[PDB]
Structure 1
Amino acid sequence: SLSTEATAKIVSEFGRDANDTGSTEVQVALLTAQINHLQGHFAEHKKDHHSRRGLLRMVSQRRKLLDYLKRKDVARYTQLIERLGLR
């Protein structure tokens, strides 16, 4: 999981305000940060079954948050997809 400094850094950049402790922008971005650190270890440690359970959960949460945001506000959804480099 992320360092304390790394969470504070991510929440301050994707949060709409410093007090925006849990917007979808924040949650999706944090998940994207974790997933980007976990694919670099899981491509090397191919025998590490316990980490594939962690990855498949963490990707599936990201998708639910994104589907919710898409219907809620397509402009927020489009910007968030850009800022995270997703397709």
Structure 2
Amino acid sequence: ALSVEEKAQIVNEYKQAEGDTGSPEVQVALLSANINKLQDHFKANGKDHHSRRGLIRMVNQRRKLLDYLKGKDVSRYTALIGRLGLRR
């Protein structure tokens, strides 16, 4: 549901090596933006299970990436959790 401009400004805001789209932080930010964006769509369309499957897949991907990042570096983990405003 994201746009080209939205993704570009997200990666610009969260890039860590001036051209890295694969670092955990960028992917986590993109997934969080998409999850937050799809909420209002699912507010109106409660009977759309087929898309909610993809939403759950994105949630699982974000969870796994956060777990890996926490396992690797605690400081970057805490910083990312702080900026994204999510519990854990």
TM-score (norm 1): 0.95
Distance (Å, rounded) in 1 between the aligned partners of 2:53 and 2:21: 26
Q: Which runs of 4+ in 1 moved over 4 A?
A: none
Match of 2:5 in 1: 5
Task: List per-residue Cα deviations over 1:30-56 (Å, max 9, x = no partner).
Answer: 000000011111122101111111111
Match of 1:75 in 2: 75
**CA RMSD, Structure 1 to Structure 2 (Å):** 0.9
Structure 1 regions of 5+ residues with no counterpart? none
Query: 1:78 Cα deviation (Å)?
Result: 0.3
Match of 2:16 in 1: 16
Match of 2:56 in 1: 56
Structure 2 regions of 5+ residues with no counterpart? none
Tell me the number of residue pairs that the alignment of Structure 1 and Structure 2 aligns: 87
Match of 2:36 in 1: 36
Q: Does the aligned pair in 1 maintain the 2:21–2:27 contact within 8 Å?
A: no
SS at match of 2:16: coil
Distance (Å, rounded) in 1 between the aligned partners of 2:3 and 2:21: 16
Distance (Å, rounded) in 1 between the aligned partners of 2:47 and 2:81: 32
